[PDB]
Amino acid sequence: SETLNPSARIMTFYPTMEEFRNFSRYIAYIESQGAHRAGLAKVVPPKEWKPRASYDDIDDLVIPAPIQQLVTGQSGLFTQYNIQKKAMTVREFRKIANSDKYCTPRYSEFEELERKYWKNLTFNPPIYGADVNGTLYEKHVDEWNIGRLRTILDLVEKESGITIEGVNTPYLYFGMWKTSFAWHTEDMDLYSINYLHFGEPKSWYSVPPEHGKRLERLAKGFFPGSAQSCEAFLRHKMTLISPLMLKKYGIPFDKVTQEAGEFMITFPYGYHAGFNHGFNCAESTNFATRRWIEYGKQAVLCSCRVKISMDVFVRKFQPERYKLWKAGKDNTVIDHTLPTPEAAEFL
Numbered sequence: 001s002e003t004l005n006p007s008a009r010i011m012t013f014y015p016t017m018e019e020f021r022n023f024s025r026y027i028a029y030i031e032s033q034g035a036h037r038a039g040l041a042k043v044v045p046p047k048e049w050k051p052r053a054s055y056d057d058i059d060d061l062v063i064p065a066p067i068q069q070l071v072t073g074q075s076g077l078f079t080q081y082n083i084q085k086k087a088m089t090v091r092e093f094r095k096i097a098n099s100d101k102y103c104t105p106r107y108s109e110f111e112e113l114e115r116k117y118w119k120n121l122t123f124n125p126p127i128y129g130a131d132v133n134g135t136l137y138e139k140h141v142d143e144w145n146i147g148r149l150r151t152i153l154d155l156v157e158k159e160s161g162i163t164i165e166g167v168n169t170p171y172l173y174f175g176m177w178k179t180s181f182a183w184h185t186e187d188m189d190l191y192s193i194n195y196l197h198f199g200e201p202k203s204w205y206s207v208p209p210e211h212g213k214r215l216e217r218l219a220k221g222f223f224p225g226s227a228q229s230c231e232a233f234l235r236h237k238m239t240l241i242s243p244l245m246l247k248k249y250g251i252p253f254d255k256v257t258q259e260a261g262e263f264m265i266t267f268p269y270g271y272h273a274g275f276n277h278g279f280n281c282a283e284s285t286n287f288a289t290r291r292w293i294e295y296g297k298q299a300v301l302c303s304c305r306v307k308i309s310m311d312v313f314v315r316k317f318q319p320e321r322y323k324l325w326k327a328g329k330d331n332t333v334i335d336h337t338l339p340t341p342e343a344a345e346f347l
């Protein structure tokens with residue numbers, strides 16, 4: 001029942017060109033409709049819109065640090081170690097991805113591929129061209145430009161000039177079959193934007209922010225070692241947990257598949273994971289709304305090694321609370337079901 005509640009299930013949205021042109025306000029729109037409570041939403045951009053003319057001219061693009069994803073575990077509980085490989089071009093990455101050893105296996109519908117994924121993730125370790133600095137948007141595209149979204153996350157750079165690779169700048173991800181991202185919320189529990197430029201699909205699991213603590217508790221239970229060492233160990237982005245285990249332990253979750261040309265928005269304190277079906281290319285970065293600031297103040301951070309100083313955000317957007325907050329006496333409690341204040345117009 002908390003399991004099935006559609007107020008917390010993954011929504012898809014199909015904006016007009018008109019509504020698509022204003023990024024930050026469409027985000028408030030989708031929150032006005034409950035998008036946020038799943039932790040993950042799909043936005044299908046209008047059909048005419050193309051961020052780039054052709055993807056035929058990137059064969060020579062360098063993937064500086066491809067990673068080979070070794071996974072270890074059994075009984076739905078795994079740990080992924082990314083081993084660094086020599087630099088290769090996109091062309092050489094495509095070659096390995098499409099070969100007999102690494103290609104997508106044969107399958108009828110998504111559930112079969114899903115079973116193949118969870119059965120074989122420890123075998124035949126694929127290479128993921130992850131975290132490449134760069135963007136495939138053409139210089140001139142003013143709608144949903146992952147390299148320049150212009151949200152209030154940019155306040156750190158206005159005031160200091162300081163950027164953080166991947167959070168304030170764009171990353172590309174060249175996937176092949178079975179390459180994975182572990183269970184995680186974003187750095188500083190930010191929002192994220194992920195756009196599949198081309199190729200085979202990317203499937204995603206998301207846990208609703210209102211139930212995120214349950215996933216932490218499950219993860220503590222089955223990795224107490226990792227949890228002694230570091231209260232926020234999910235932030236290492238190394239832990240995979242199967243849908244069967246989530247179901248079994250009462251963690252509500254939902255699933256969706258992202259196809260070429262679609263955007264996925266992850267929301268504050270939204271745990272997600274997933275894998276690629278086959279050769280593909282996705283771009284992402286982080287962003288913020290006014291709602292994020294409290295998530296930023298309260299984010300439980302890695303206690304054993306990325307950190308945004310919230311002072312500037314509280315100063316600008318929460319001026320009266322600032323002194324009370326620096327005192328350590330600001331016990332604002334987050335309601336994860338609430339839309340951002342920018343949504344108020346859509347009522």
Ligand SMILES: COc1ccc2c(c1)CCC[C@H]2CNc1cnccc1C(=O)O
Pocket residue numbers: 082128130173180181182194202236237238272282
């Ligand atoms: C520090 O350890 C890390 C950090 C980052 C990663 C990995 C390991 C595994 C490869 C994927 C990337 C993260 N990839 C994603 C994160 N969130 C949403 C989607 C993706 C994706 O891979 O498409």
Ligand code: NI
Pocket residue numbers: 184185186192266272
């Ligand atoms: Ni993510």
Ligand SMILES: [Zn+2]
Pocket residue numbers: 229230231232233236302303304305
């Ligand atoms: Zn840690």
